[PDB]
Amino acid sequence: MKSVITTTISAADAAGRFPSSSDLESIQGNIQRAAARLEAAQKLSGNHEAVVKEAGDACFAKYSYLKNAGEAGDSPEKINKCYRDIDHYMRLINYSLVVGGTGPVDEWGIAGSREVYRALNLPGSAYIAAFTFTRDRLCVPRDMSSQAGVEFTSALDYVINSLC
């Protein structure tokens, strides 16, 4: 699970080295930045239902064609799975913010996604719409502090880039 700690330790392990100065210094980055990302994680934890509902509404408003017969949201069960997916990504973004690395979203959300979405006919632009909406909708310091917002924004941009 990619983080400052695992990245540093894996690099040292590959070289058969005990942790040294730069390894210790890397982790000081954790100590310093945890506050901003944990706040963003916290805000996302306590307000995810709302965040997800809006992102999902945003997606189906921009792509109503999805509700047409044969498309990805041509039934209530499919529409629900769509919001559910948006929630899984937000949950993985929450995890990524807690971990301080993209490990969680990379392994649990991104990996294999292109095959799954291709096989199940889920257009990537629909997810991108959901995420671009959530990102641009972020208001600072109304929703969270500036730096927590930067962390939240980076995480969404990371996920959006994974789809295009």
Binding site: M1, S3, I5, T6, T8, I9, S10, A12, D13, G16, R17, F18, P19, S20, D23, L24, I27, Q28, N30, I31, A34, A35, L38, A41, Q42, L44, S45, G46, H48, H88, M90, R91, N94, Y95, V98, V99, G100, G103, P104, W108
Partner: protein, 177 residues
């Protein structure tokens, strides 16, 4: 491998639950005690050769048959291999202490270590003893109570770090013997 944070993430994921509230409290403590953790690791790595040679030597002075012909530490090749193993175990324990999770130790070091030792005829009971001495030394360095060496450090409590480190050595020990 996992660290203190992703460990909490894998546990939350099992319930498809976001991380928040109580969960974060445990992790904010980690951050708060981050500097003490960094000193604890620094203390182990800064005295690595001493911790390793003293434990392997301690293992030997308690069981001289290890160096008698036929003993597992007989010949320079075998002594070097044992010294190296000692270093490797301390290196993985120091990784676990830095990460705040035994993941790296379990998967990259302990996984199949006993099998290996049994196959080679490496005496597991002696190994446990070596690990115990390393535990006694490492824990002594973490709390800056090592006899032959004292360092300058902000006074404070590091008992939780000492116990966490001790549990990692204990894990090596129970997986080996």
């Amino acid at each position: 491998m996992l660290d203190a944070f992703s460990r909490v993430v894998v546990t939350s994921d099992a319930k498809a639950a976001y991380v928040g509230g109580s969960d974060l409290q445990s992790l904010k403590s980690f951050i708060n005690d981050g500097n003490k953790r960094l000193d604890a690791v620094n203390y182990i790595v800064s005295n690595a050769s001493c911790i390793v040679s003293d434990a392997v030597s301690g293992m030997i002075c308690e069981n001289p048959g290890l160096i008698a012909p036929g003993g597992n530490c007989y010949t320079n090749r075998r002594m070097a291999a044992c010294l190296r193993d000692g270093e490797i175990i301390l290196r993985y324990v120091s990784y676990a202490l830095l990460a705040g999770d035994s993941s790296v130790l379990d998967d990259r070091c302990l996984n199949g270590l006993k099998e290996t030792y049994i196959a080679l005829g490496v005496p597991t009971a002696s190994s446990s003893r070596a690990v115990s001495i390393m535990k006694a030394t490492a824990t002594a360095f973490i709390t800056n109570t090592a006899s032959g060496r004292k360092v300058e450090v902000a006074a404070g409590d590091c008992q939780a770090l000492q116990a966490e480190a001790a549990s990692y050595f204990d894990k090596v020990g129970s997986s080996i013997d």
